[PDB]
Structure formats: C-alpha cells, structure tokens
C-alpha cells in the first residue's frame, strides 16, 4: 500500500507515533517519506547483506528475522514480511522500540540527513488529525 501523506499522519497518530520518545508527528512522516515513499511493500538490500522493510526501512540485521541475514538479531521478534502489510501496526511497534534504544530517531539515516532540523511540521499542514 502507498499511503498518502495525511492519510499516514492520521495512521501513525493512531498508533502512538505523536511525541513518541519526545518526536512530533511530522518527523514521523518525513522518516517515512525519505525512507520509503509511504509505501508499504519497500525493501532494499544493504552493502553488509541485510534488507531494509517497510514504511521506515527497518533492518534485518538487528529488528526481524528474513532468514537470509546471518548472524544479526530479530529484536522485533517478527519476520521482517510483517513489515510489508498494510497495516503499519507492526512498523510502528518496532519502531517504537528502535527510537527508543538510545540514539533516537538518528537510527533513520534518511532523517538524520533530511529531516532532522527541518521544519518537519510541514508534513503534517492541513491534514485532519
Ligand atoms: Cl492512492
Ligand atoms: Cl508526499
Ligand atoms: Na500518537
Ligand atoms: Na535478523
Ligand atoms: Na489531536
Ligand atoms: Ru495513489
Ligand atoms: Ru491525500
Ligand atoms: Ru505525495
């Protein structure tokens, strides 16, 4: 699913996302943005042979298991496929426990370079909430 931009806002608000470890809703939906276009079925391969899943391109080496990542962590506890479905819930669970593991949402490199300190309320104008 490709989620449009208020339609994701009102989504992730939903689930917690607003103020989640102190992250307004707008970076939320910037990191989607950036990370995978809102779209659900993303997947990249890294250089080091993990895969990146998802609305927020959560990675196989330490969040879900793929079965083709050796060695890495599954700290989701969920196969990094539940990361595709439609419905964000299990994107957001684990991202909730990523951001909260102690360098915040640095651990999204797309909003390390793209959204942090922009004006990231941006994302969320004119939507209902
Ligand atoms: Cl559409
Ligand atoms: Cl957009
Ligand atoms: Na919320
Ligand atoms: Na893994
Ligand atoms: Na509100
Ligand atoms: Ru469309
Ligand atoms: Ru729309
Ligand atoms: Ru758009």
Known sequence: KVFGRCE???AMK?????????????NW???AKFESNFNTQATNRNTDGSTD???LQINSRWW????????????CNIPCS????????ASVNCAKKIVSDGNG?????AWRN??????????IRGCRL
Not at 105 to 109: G, I, S, Y
């Open 8 to 10: 994701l806002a009102a």
């Open 14 to 26: 939903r689930h917690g996302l607003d103020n989640y470890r102190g992250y307004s809703l707008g």
């Open 29 to 31: 939906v910037c990191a």
């Open 53 to 55: 899943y998802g609305i």
């Open 64 to 75: 879900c298991n793929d079965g083709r990542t050796p060695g890495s962590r599954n700290l």
């Open 82 to 89: 539940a990361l595709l479905s439609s419905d964000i819930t």
């Open 105 to 109: 949402m640095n651990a999204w490199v």
């Open 114 to 123: 793209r959204c942090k300190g922009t004006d990231v309320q941006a994302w």
